[PDB]
Each structure stands twice: as C-alpha cells, then as structure tokens.
Design an enzyme around this catalytic site. Structure first.
Site, short mmCIF file in Angstrom:
data_model
loop_
_atom_site.label_atom_id
_atom_site.label_comp_id
_atom_site.label_asym_id
_atom_site.label_seq_id
_atom_site.Cartn_x
_atom_site.Cartn_y
_atom_site.Cartn_z
N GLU B 43 29.69 44.17 47.30
CA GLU B 43 29.51 43.73 45.92
C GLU B 43 29.58 42.21 45.87
OE1 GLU B 43 32.56 45.12 43.33
OE2 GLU B 43 32.49 43.35 42.03
N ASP B 108 46.31 33.42 48.29
CA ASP B 108 45.94 32.17 47.64
C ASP B 108 47.17 31.29 47.48
OD1 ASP B 108 44.62 30.13 46.31
OD2 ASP B 108 43.49 31.48 45.01
N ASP B 110 48.19 27.81 45.23
CA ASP B 110 47.79 26.88 44.19
C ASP B 110 48.66 25.63 44.28
OD1 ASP B 110 46.51 26.18 41.43
OD2 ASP B 110 48.67 26.05 41.08
#
Lengths: 121, 419, 431, 82
Positions: B43, B108, B110
């Site tokens: 996808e 992740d 940040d």
DNA sequence: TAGGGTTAGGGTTAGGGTTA
C-alpha cells in the site's frame, strides 16, 4: 476495476488451456471441504471422465458448505509449482436444479456468434 | 543557495525523471519474490499539490511504478503494510476479509520533544552542538537492538529536518503481532510521564543489565556535551528547576553551594560530592541510590512514541523523500561513521540540480554519441551526482541482505537434503 | 477404560472435542452454569487482587458450589472433569462472533487456568507438562555460572544469589511476553534466561493463549453451518441480549465549570488556555462533545472559533482541521460513526507525553499537582484526604465519584461511574 | 472515406431512440460517440440514448449522496451511479 | 347510423481525493 470473467467449461481448464493469471468463471459439483487449509475440491463429470479443480477460499469466509451440490466460481487462476492450478475465489454462489446442457449450449452459441461477428474484421 | 518553495516542482519532476534510484528501490521492496506477489500487495500513499491526501496505490511491476511516478509527480512517499489483496481493488472483496498481514518494524525520534530540557535553540531551530543528542540516541538504540534481540539487518534514515527513523527489515520480525511490538517499545522506553510529572525516572537499588550498559556507554558523551556545551547549571532558574529533581532535605545547602560556586563544573562536582555523601547516609528515603544516574538519564535519554509502532497499518515517510521546507534529501546514515554525520552537509535538491546541469555541461565534451537506453543514462547520471556515497551504502545494505538470503536458502537446502 | 482415559488430570488444554451424546436440558444447564462461573470469577478477580487468601478461598467456594472440578482428590473426578470439558467447548462454540468477545473469553479462561495451576503441586505440574505436547530445554551449569551476574541483577523476585539448586530454561523471546514487557528477564540475541516458577507459569499461559486464539479462529468458520433450529434460543441468549437534546454554543463554559468530570476537566482547561491540542486530546474531546448533544454545525463553529483564537488561517482550517472533523463525526468517507472512549479505556489508553494533556489526572498526574488542582476547585480537606487515599488504592473511579459528590453537594452519587457520558447526563439531570 | 454520422435532424425517426436497448458491455465500452451532440453515442448508424444491463455486482463503494457499483456481464465491467 | 369520447401527455440537473 478488475478484468471481466469469461466462461470456461471444466475440462478445458482441467487441461490447462488458459494463460496464467487469467480471470475465468466455471462450474462444478463440490466433493470435499478441507476445513483447516481452506481448500475446496469440486468435481464435474464428462461422460466416463471426472475432472477436478482446486479452489482457494480465503476471501469468502464465513461460508456454508452443501455437500454434493453444484456451484459457480469466479476469480483468477494461478499456476502453482506443485499444486498445479488453483483459482482465487472472489464470488462463490450456489445454484441447484439448473440443467447443464442448456448452459453448455448457451456458451457454445455465444462463442459461435462472437466468432461470426469476428469474420468481418 | 536558500531553498524557495516557488521553484520546487520543476526540480521535483527532474529528480523523478533522472536521479530517483528506482532499480535499488524495487530490489529492496521485491525481496527476491520468494513469496508470490509479495511486492504486488503493498500500500502506498502519495501527497499531490494543494495538500490532497490519497492512498492505496499498488503497482503491478517496476516499469508501471516508474511510469506512474513520472506522470504523477507527488511530494511525499510513504510505505504501508502487505495485505491479502491488491490495495487498488480493496472495494472488490467482502468487508472484514481485507486485513493487514505484515509490515516492517519502525521507530521514530522527534528532536522537538526535548524543549523543556534543551536550551541551545528555540522550537524548530537546530545547532551542531545538539546533534550529539540524536547521535547518542542512535548509538543506544542500535546497540540495544543488535545485542539484546540480535536483529541482523538495520537501516537508519535521516528524515531531513529533525528526525531519524529505524527500518528493521529482518525476516522473523515482519510476521510479529501488535502485542509483541508493543512489548518491544515498552522495554525500550524509560522516560515515562506526562507534562504534569517532573521526574521521569523512579529506579530502585537494583539496576537492570540494560540500564547498566546504557549508563556505561553514556558516560563518555554526557560530560563534555552537558557541562561545556549546554551548561545546564548556568543560571539561577537553571538550578532552581534542577533541585525539583532531588529531595528537599538538601535544597538549601545545594542552593548555597551553587551561590558560592562560579561555573557549572564546580556545581556539578559539588552535586556529585553531596550525592555520594547522602548515599553513605541514607536514612529512610524512598529515592533511589542513583541520583546522578537518574538525572543524567532524565536529561539525556531518548524518547520514543508507542503509537507509531503499535499500529500495523500505520504510515511513515519513505527514504529518498524531499522535504518541502529545506530541500534536503533523506539519505541513509552509515553505521560506522555516525560521529562524522553533519546534518547541514547533506546535499539538497537545488544543489543536486545545479550538479546535474554541470554534469550535462561536462557531457557536452566527454560523453557523446551514445545509443543507450534510459537505464544506462540514468545510471551514469546518478553516478556522477553527489548521492553516490548514499546509494553505495544502500547497495551495501542490500548486498548484506542478499547474502543473508543466500545463507538462509543454503540452510534450507541443507535441511531439505537437496544438493 | 473410557472414563480414566478421557480424564487423567484435573487440568487440560482442551484439545480433544468429545464424542458422546447429551440431552438438551443438560446441555443448557452446563452452558449457563459455566457462564455464571466465568462471570463470578471475573468479578472476583477485578474486585480483589491476585493471590492472598480471601480471594482464592472465595473462588474455591464458588467452584465447589457450582459442582465443577477444582481440587485433586484422587477419587470420583469423572463427572466434574466431563462437565468442565463439555461446558468449556460449548462456550468455545458460543463466543466466536466479535473480536472483543473473543478477547474477553480468552482473558477469563486465562484467569481460571492461572488459578487452577496455582493450586497444582510441583510433581503434578511436571506430570501435566509431560502429558502436554510441550518441549523445554535446560542449560548447563557452566553457562549458568557464567551468566550469574545478569540473572541476579535482573531481579526476578530473586533474593541475593539464590540460584543454587535451580534449573534455568532458555526460551525464544516471542513466547514470554509477560515477563518480557516488565524488564524482569535478561535478554541476549533473541533469547531469554529465566528462573523456574514464574517463567513456567507465564510460558504456559502465553502458549495456551496462542493455541486458544488459533482454535477460535478455526471455529469461526463453523457457525456458517450452525443452521439447526434447536440451540438457537440458547445462542441468542448468550449473544449479549447519551442522546440529550440540542444545546447552545455559549453554555459550554458554564457546563465545563459545572458538569465536566475530572478525567476531562484538565483537557478542557488546557484547551481553553492554549487554544490548541494534539491528536490524543483532540479525538477524546471531539468524541465527548459529540456524545453530549452537539451538532455538526455547532461543533464546526466551536472548533473554528477556538482555533481562530489560536492564530491560524481560515483556508488552512478548512483544508486540515474542519476536514478532519467532518470524518470525526462520520459525515463522509467511511462514515463509521465512533462511540466516545470509556473511562476504563482512557485510563488504560496510550500514556500521554510532553505536549499532551489527554488522560484522567487520577492516573497520569503528580500528587502535588493533583492536590493543587483540587484546591483550585474548592475541595474540603477531608475530601482531599479521601481522594488521596482512593488514589493510593488505585480506585480512580471512586475518586471520580467523590469529586462528583463534592462538586454537586450530594452525599451519595448512587450510580457507578463507567463513561463520561454517564457523568454528563447525570449532571444535566441534576441541573 | 470519412464516415459521416447521420444528421441530428433525423435521429428521432428511428424507433430505437426512445427505447431501452440491450447491449453487450464490451460493445458499450468500445462503441464511439458523436461530435455534433456530445452526451449521446452512435453505433452502426443507430443512435442510442438508453441502455439496459444485467449481471453480477463485484464492486461496492459509498459516497455522500450517490452510491457506486461495478457490474459484470461475462465480457466487461462498467461503473454504475445510483 | 353504428367507438368508445375525440385530450397529449413522462422528455432536467445532482460529484472523490481520506486513516484511528
């Protein structure tokens, strides 16, 4: 949008007379429903010959089974390495009492008309 | 030169036409085709102009992918999960039978999540001094993954502005459920608490081996950075908010010591001496015996987000993207040269386009009369550019993965007695 | 020897469906009895804590009352074991409709199995594992001594190098999730070195959960052929069986100062202060306002006003925020209308981080900040002490009840708190 | 020779113009349009304005005010708007 | 002096590019 579904009698697809990845719609009578592996083995008679087609069912669960009944399957065909030919089901409905000869003559006539119109081009 | 948002689209079209590494990208995604249509059931989610969000864009083959990329010219590229059917025909199957099956584990980081602790910059600003933060975070996470769990293949990508992403792409990890990934992220997380909470660590006397390894590998970087560069203990309000992390029994004494002291080094040494004195004089204190350790972890440990890894159908930026604010192209980061990675030296889209113009200028007198297809021309094009080390690192990772596949197939041959 | 062969032990992974024949009334009785027992054990587990003596004693009393198999007297266990087997597979047939129902069934079965194993002698656990189709591995004392420091510093309730006279098993990481998550086991290249008792219990629990999940998935495709007219009322019986009128856009402040429960008062205060909120708080607040009688247009105007106070651009608002809000209420797109989060879900939701305010303060706030905020609401010192004691007891719902009673000046709330819509509707009834 | 479509002033003289014609879905896909009047289609000299199809539905999609349906008649697939 | 009532009637248009 998907590709359309052309009709095919059981014995032709049993002999592998269609290209891999094609979309086809055929008929037959169920013989066994392998519960754990999600596999369906339907059969169709031809005189003294009986032909078998393997149907994956991973896209229509939940699904009731009617032992010894006719069926209509529409989907795509994948030529497996060892299992041979198996059709990926997209829609699988059950029809009973419909006579085969009318259907066979119907596709024969439609093919004849298509070829006749194909004689002008 | 200064990146301008009013000139990007033509450069983006040129990049998608010439420099985008389609061959390596397909080679990574295809995985060698051991599983039928594994790549065919992926996808994608583009983002066209005017911030219009689309998704579920499968691709039949590499050539179709190239043609659609050339025609569409999107801004952001993302990767989803592998489903049981082609995503572009998702409405052709009964509801409930179209479920996500596998995806790569990701994390992740940040940079902006450290505002209350950091003081070098403000909000969305960066400095070369604060890069050590994500450097040591990368080292900690990579070491933990390599040793504790033994995951073989890893690929670190710099987002472009403030973040770095982890792309674990091993074999026995893609099949994991959601609970296992949640457990991974929980085990890898230590800074716990919301805005209302001040202290981010509550450690008992016992110390886990993971914490021991982290504190051992964190000492060599904490001293210089913290004491010299940021100078946490510089101002009055600095140690005023510092003392909230320690019991009030010595607040006045430490404040007086800071008043007497002149620089942050002396204050830190006095803090260490006071802490050591209190450890020998522990008297009915619920606090841990590692005040210095816990404050260093609180102001120094990386912070993750469970939401980006708990979901299985979630989306995250693909490598080799183009950030619409700075034009820096997301490139892989070498594992053995992490300490020599300056964020400001990464080539940008405008610089690489001027490099392409100069490359054509050289080709005006060096490469002429070539009857080659676009494949070889684009190959020499991105060879002549500044992306060569990055694509080389990507190719080296792909070669490592290919060698792993060779080893696994040879093991399967040994088990299956087929020689 | 059908009786003995069928039932060798009081514990069983339930892998062999039976083959005998039963009357319908006995079928119904077994179904209702086991569902009653499961509900009772769920309630007892959620009320008290694991272990102790009162909880286990009450559970044993419930088991003995409901004529099931709980102990291991070596005589006359045929009937209880058979009844347990039959009723467990009947409920396995029953609870195969929705994913959440499956999860609830798995959790309750896990609790029951943990109890029964906790009352199982060690020689009997070894025999039960031997009859089970499970394989364990034992490491050698050489590496046992080599990795002494890690296995003692992991603190798996270990007491100062008690590894003498112990056997250590090596297990892949993906099977010991419970001890994996809490950071209580040493790890190395995808392997776990563990003590005996806790890991054997947890490994058994995890493999049982996985196998039951697989069997439930397999049985999911059976009800397609369960067209029998009989047993239909029973299945229907086991299958289980917030619209206040419209409000204005300016009374929200007064209602918030009056009717918002603590689990959302902090979120409202932060929204009214900074005029900006992140995803976790935003969906929660939107769902709550939808569930208390706010229309699409009123909510759009409210959000646009409170975000214009946040110095945005109206075109950017239309592109991003109202765009998200439209599907937040199921106006377009998939339009799957979403129910508001429950109190239990919010308390057990994703833990908020810096820059986030979602989550009830009774679970994710400092005690001093909680006391200060309570004092800002004019809470009596006795009420403050009671709230602190309830927080210490992890009874967040009871603390919310006390806050409701204090703010509304009612001696007894009279209703158990489970969802913020309940709180708001009761407050509106009071008003 | 440039095949000239019949002038629009004589379309109604055909009895087919006001009727619901039955066609193969491949034919309705592959049959051409008319330049002088867009919105109507021309097939073998017989202008066609209305069609009737039957088959098995293989695609469902919902929108704010109109449904979507992908029908199949053993030779091709076309979208439907309701 | 042979049929009844004989009347012409519906004949537009609606929008993708979306997840908890």
């Amino acid at each position: 949008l998907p590709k359309p579904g052309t009709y095919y009698l059981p014995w032709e697809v049993s002999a592998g007379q269609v290209p891999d990845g094609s979309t086809l719609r055929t008929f037959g009578r169920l013989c066994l429903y392998d519960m754990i592996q999600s596999r369906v083995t339907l059969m169709a008679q031809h005189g003294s010959d009986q032909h078998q087609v393997l149907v994956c069912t991973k896209l229509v669960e939940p699904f009731h089974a009617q032992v010894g009944s006719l069926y209509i399957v529409l989907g795509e065909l994948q030529h497996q390495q060892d299992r041979g030919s198996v059709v990926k089901a997209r829609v699988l409905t059950c029809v009973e009492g419909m006579n085969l000869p009318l259907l066979e003559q119907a596709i024969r006539e439609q093919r004849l008309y298509k070829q006749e119109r194909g004689g002008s081009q | 030169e200064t990146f301008d948002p009013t000139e990007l689209p033509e450069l983006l079209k040129l990049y998608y036409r010439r420099l985008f590494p389609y061959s390596q990208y397909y080679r990574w995604l295809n995985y060698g085709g051991v599983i039928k249509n594994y790549f065919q059931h992926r996808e994608f989610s583009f983002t066209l102009k005017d911030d219009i969000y689309i998704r579920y864009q499968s691709f039949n083959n590499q050539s179709d992918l190239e043609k659609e990329m050339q025609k569409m010219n999107p801004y952001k590229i993302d990767i989803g999960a592998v489903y049981s059917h082609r995503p572009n025909q998702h409405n052709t199957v009964k509801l409930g039978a179209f479920q996500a099956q596998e995806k790569e584990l990701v994390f992740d980081i940040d940079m902006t999540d450290y505002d209350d602790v950091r003081r070098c910059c403000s909000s969305a600003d960066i400095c070369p001094k604060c890069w050590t933060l994500m450097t040591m975070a990368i080292r900690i996470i990579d070491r933990a993954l390599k040793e504790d769990f033994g995951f073989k293949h890893r690929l670190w990508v710099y987002s472009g502005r403030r973040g770095v992403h982890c792309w674990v792409c091993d074999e026995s990890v893609r099949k994991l459920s959601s609970a296992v990934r949640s457990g991974i992220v929980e085990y890898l997380s230590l800074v716990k608490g919301g805005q209302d909470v001040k202290k981010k660590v509550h450690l008992s006397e016992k110390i886990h081996p993971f914490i021991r390894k982290s504190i051992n590998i964190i000492k060599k970087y904490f001293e210089e950075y913290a004491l010299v560069n940021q100078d946490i203990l510089e101002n009055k309000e600095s140690w005023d908010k510092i003392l909230a992390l320690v019991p009030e029994t010595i607040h006045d004494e430490l404040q007086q010591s800071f008043q007497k002291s002149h620089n942050s080094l002396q204050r830190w040494e006095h803090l260490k001496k006071v802490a050591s004195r209190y450890q020998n004089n522990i008297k009915n204190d619920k606090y841990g015996p590692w005040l210095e350790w816990e404050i260093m972890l609180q102001y120094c440990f990386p912070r993750l987000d469970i939401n980006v890894s708990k979901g299985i159908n979630h989306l995250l930026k693909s490598p080799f993207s183009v950030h619409p604010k700075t034009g820096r192209i997301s490139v892989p980061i070498d594992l053995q040269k992490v300490d020599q990675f300056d964020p400001f030296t990464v080539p940008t889209i405008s610089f690489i386009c001027r490099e392409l113009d100069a490359i054509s200028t050289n080709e005006e007198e060096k490469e002429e009369n070539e009857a080659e297809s676009d494949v070889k021309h684009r190959t020499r094009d991105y060879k002549k550019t500044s992306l060569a080390p990055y694509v080389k690192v990507f190719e080296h990772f792909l070669e490592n993965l290919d060698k792993s596949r060779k080893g696994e197939l040879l093991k399967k041959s040994d088990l299956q007695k087929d020689f | 020897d059908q009786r003995n062969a069928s039932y060798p032990h009081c514990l069983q992974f339930y892998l062999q469906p039976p083959s005998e024949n039963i009357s319908l009334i006995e079928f119904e009785n077994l179904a209702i009895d086991r569902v009653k027992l499961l509900k009772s054990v769920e309630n007892l587990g959620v009320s008290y804590v694991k272990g102790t003596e009162q909880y286990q004693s009450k559970l044993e009393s419930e088991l003995r009352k409901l004529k099931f198999s709980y102990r291991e007297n070596l005589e006359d266990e045929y009937e209880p074991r058979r009844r347990d087997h039959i009723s467990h597979f009947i409920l396995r047939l029953a609870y195969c409709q929705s994913e959440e129902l499956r999860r609830w069934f798995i959790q309750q079965e896990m609790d029951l199995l943990r109890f029964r194993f906790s009352i199982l002698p060690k020689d009997k656990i070894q025999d039960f594992l031997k009859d089970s189709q499970l394989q364990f591995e034992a490491i050698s004392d050489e590496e046992k001594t080599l990795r002494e420091q890690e296995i003692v510093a992991s603190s798996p309730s270990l007491s100062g190098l008690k590894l003498g006279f112990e056997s250590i098993y090596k297990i892949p990481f993906a099977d010991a999730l419970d001890l994996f998550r809490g950071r209580k086991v040493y790890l190395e290249d995808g392997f776990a070195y563990v003590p005996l008792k806790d890991i054997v219990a947890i490994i058994l629990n995890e493999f049982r959960a996985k196998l039951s999940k697989a069997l439930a998935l397999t049985a999911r495709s059976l009800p397609a052929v369960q067209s029998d007219e009989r047993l239909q009322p029973l299945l229907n019986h086991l299958s289980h069986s917030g619209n206040v009128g419209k409000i204005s856009l300016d009374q929200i402040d007064l209602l918030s100062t009056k009717s918002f429960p603590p689990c959302m008062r902090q979120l409202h205060k932060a929204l009214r202060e900074n005029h900006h909120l992140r995803h976790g708080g935003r969906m929660q607040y939107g769902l709550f306002l939808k569930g208390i009688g706010l229309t699409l247009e009123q909510a759009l105007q409210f959000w646009k006003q409170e975000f214009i106070k946040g110095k945005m651009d109206p075109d950017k608002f239309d592109k991003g925020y109202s765009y998200n809000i439209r599907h937040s209420f199921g106006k377009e797109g998939k339009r799957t209308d979403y129910t508001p989060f429950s109190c239990l879900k919010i308390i057990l939701s994703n833990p908020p981080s810096q820059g986030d305010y979602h989550g009830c303060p009774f679970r994710h706030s400092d005690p001093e900040l909680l006391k200060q905020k309570l004092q800002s609401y004019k809470i009596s010192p006795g009420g403050i002490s009671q709230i602190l004691d309830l927080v210490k007891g992890t009874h967040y719902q009871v603390a919310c009840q006390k806050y409701f009673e204090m703010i509304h000046n009612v001696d007894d709330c009279g209703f158990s708190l489970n969802h913020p819509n309940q709180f708001f509707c009761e407050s509106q009834r009071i008003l | 020779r440039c095949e000239e479509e019949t002038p629009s002033l004589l379309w109604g003289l055909d009895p087919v113009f006001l009727a619901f014609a039955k066609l193969y879905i491949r034919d309705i896909l592959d049959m051409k349009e008319s330049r002088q009047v867009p919105g109507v289609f021309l097939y073998n000299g017989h202008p066609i304005k209305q069609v009737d199809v039957l088959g098995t539905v293989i695609g469902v999609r919902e929108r704010d005010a109109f449904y979507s349906y992908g029908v199949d008649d053993s030779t091709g697939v076309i979208n439907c708007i309701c």
